[PDB]
Structures are given as structure tokens and as C-alpha cells.
Amino acid sequence: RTRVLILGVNGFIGNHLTERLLREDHYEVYGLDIGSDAISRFLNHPHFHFVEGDISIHSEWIEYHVKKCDVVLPLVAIATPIEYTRNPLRVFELDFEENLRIIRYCVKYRKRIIFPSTAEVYGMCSDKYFDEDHSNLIVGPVNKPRWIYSVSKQLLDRVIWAYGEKEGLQFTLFRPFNWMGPRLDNLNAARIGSSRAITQLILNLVEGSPIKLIDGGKQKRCFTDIRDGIEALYRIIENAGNRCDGEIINIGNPENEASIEELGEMLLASFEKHPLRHHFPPFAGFRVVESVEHRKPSIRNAHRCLDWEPKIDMQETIDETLDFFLRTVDLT
């Protein structure tokens, strides 16, 4: 069976991907992280192996597992917006430098790497549909620190593309668009995966704080149920016909589009009608605050390379992600 190394497995994508692979009979999962609370249900599984580790501290221990495995998925990164500008140097040392080491182990040992790039790479691209192969990337002046996350991830994509071109590194890059469902990552966890926007709004509802709408909350985003999203990540791992080699694939549901304001409304509506509503404080309302306007993905590469098409409707994802969250909260 194919050995899949998940770096930063203790989280949203790690949980769902693991469930998926183990469901199959030809995969061996090595989940590396500093903790396992989020994937404890798998610790006893015969084909799951927890590996104590940290990509910032361990050098050798990780290089070892890269050589021991077949496919590598680096999920450790700081993707929370505040942090970009808050502690830029850390975001750069972890997201860029540490991940580069791992990218390099993959080329050294000729392993396949499935790397999570970001939709932020497109920046303020004017295309209505962000295309992995044709869209230009637009960012602000350097005096706008907000873009350091975007440009860093973008440089990594280029470095990977360079290794694939000059050193035969086998790879596939994927760009997730607001993945959501049960088991969302903690808002401050350095594991990429769950949509931060919906995690934040649900927290607002759960804690009784207002839903901040920046400049009206008119910016639009696309939401993807994790059942759809993880199904695509799964096929990238399958790599039928090797169609994913050297590819950059957007993974999101372009039909689930909503402004932050509408998202807040749908969430609130589903919240009010929920059985456990009474255990949460009263809604604090929407606060308009004023200190990227659209992010719709082209999914032609996913159709082509994966024969994938998102099947879950917006409401369904909304209701299920909120439901699971509310029933998981520790009221004491």
C-alpha cells in the first residue's frame, strides 16, 4: 500500500483525509504532529501511525519519514489574516522557510508532494473566475504588509514548479476555497484547511459577540463542503492516469457564493432554528466596521484531472457545519 505522510495531521484536513484513505484498503497513513486529540479516533487503527513531531524543531526525524513514505502532504502553515501583519516574520519562517526544507526532502528522495497553495495567491485578480493556468496575480505595493502571506505562498509554488521542471519532482498543487464541515481547526491553529471566515462567524454566535462586517461585508467568497473538498484531495492522491502530475488545481464550489454579510445571515438563520440554540447567548447583531472583493474559482482543472464536480448545496453545508459545531461545544 501507498504510504501517505500527513504533516500537521492533528486537525480538519488531517481528520477527514485520514478517514477517507483508511476507508480504502491500499493506504498506510503516517500522521505527524505535536498532538493527536483531533484524530484520536484513529490512533488504534492498524494502518494509521502517529508520529511525534514539529517541522520547526525536527529536521532529521521528518526527513526520515519523507524517505520512508511515498506521498507527502505539508499542512503546517499560519494562514490567519491578523497574523500576516501581526508577526510577519514568524509567518514567513514557518510558512516559507520550514516548508521549503520539506519540499527539498521530497526532491532529494524523489517523493511525490501534494502541496496546499492558497486562493490568496490570485490576490486582487480581476477575472470573475480565478484560473490556475491563465489568471494574473495582483498584489499591492510592498508598503502593504497585508500581502506577505500571499506572495510567500506564491514564491513556494514557483520554487516547486522549478523543481518539477529542472529536477523531476513529482507534484500537484491544490488551492482550497473555504472548506467547511465538522471538526473545524481552532481559529489560531497553524494547520491549513477550514474556512476561517465561517469559523469566526460561528464563534461569534457561540460566544454572543457581534458579526463584524468590514466596510459592509460586501466581499464575496465561495464555500465548499468538506465531503466535496476531501473527495477531490482524495483523487489527487489516487492520481488516476497520472493526470495530476505538474498540475495546479483549485478545489472549491463556485456555486456556493456569498458575501460575508449573506453568509452571516444564513448562519444566523440556521442558528436560531437549531435545537441547541437556547444554550448560547442572544445574538449581538452585525457591526459594520471600516478600517479582495470576490474569489470565485475556475474548476476546469478539477473536472479534467479528477472528473470532480461539487455535489453539496450551500444550505446543506451551512446546516451541517453549524450543527456539528454546536453539538461539540463544551458547555462546562
CATH 3.40.50.720 in the chain, residue ranges: 1-194+224-254+292-310
CA distance 321 to 267: 10
- Which CATH fold would you assign to the domain 1-194+224-254+292-310? Rossmann fold (3.40.50)
Neighbours of 181 (CB within 10 A): 24
Encode burial over 168-178: b for 16+ CB neighbours within 10 A, e otherwise: ebbbbbbbbbb
Residue 255 appears among annotated catalytic residues:
no
Which among 28, 98, 112, 120 is annotated as catalytic? Answer: 120
Render the burial of 65-88: b for 16+ CB within 10 Å, e for the rest: bbeebebbbbbbbbbbeebbeeee
The CATH number given to 195-223+255-291+311-332 is: 3.90.25.10
d(CA 314, CA 299): 17
Q: Which of 183, 221, 235, 295 is catalytic?
A: 295
Cβ atoms of residues 74 and 11 within 8 Å: no
Resolved by: X-ray
CA distance 44 to 213: 44
∠ CA(198), CA(204), CA(205), 5° rounding?
95
Q: Residue 246: which region, alpha, beta or left (left: phi > 0; alpha: psi -120 to 50)?
A: left
Resolution as reported, in Å: 2.5
Closest CA to 61 of 21, 30, 36: 30
Residue with grid cell 500500500, as numbered in its chain: 1
Neighbours of 128 (CB within 10 A): 9
What cell numbers appear for 231 in the block?
473527495
Q: Could you tell me the three cell numbers for 191?
A: 494547520
Q: Angle CA(119)–CA(125)–CA(130) in degrees, nearest 5?
A: 50
* Cα 85 to Cα 92: distance, rounded to the nearest angstrom: 11
Question: Do 193 and 321 form a contact (C-beta atoms < 8 A)?
Answer: no
183 is catalytic: no
Boundaries of CATH 3.90.25.10 in the chain? 195-223+255-291+311-332
Distance CA 33, CA 58 (A): 11
Contact 252, 178 (CB under 8 A): yes
Sequence letter at residue 312: I
Gap between the Cα atoms of 207 and 284, Å rounded = 9
**What is the 3 state secondary structure string of the chain?**
CEEEEEECCCCHHHHHHHHHHHHCCCEEEEEEECCCHHHHHHCCCCCEEEEECCCCCCCHHHHHHHHHCCEEEECECCCCHHHHHHCHHHHHHHHHHHHHHHHHHHHHCCCEEEEECCHHHHECCCCCCECCCCCCCECCCCCCHHHHHHHHHHHHHHHHHHHHHHCCCEEEEEEECCEECCCCCCCCCCECCECHHHHHHHHHHHHCCCEEEECCCCCEEECEEHHHHHHHHHHHHHCHHHCCCCEEEEECCCCCEEEHHHHHHHHHHHHHCCCCHHHCCCCCCEEEECCCCCCCECCHHHHHHHCCCCCCCHHHHHHHHHHHHHHHCCCC
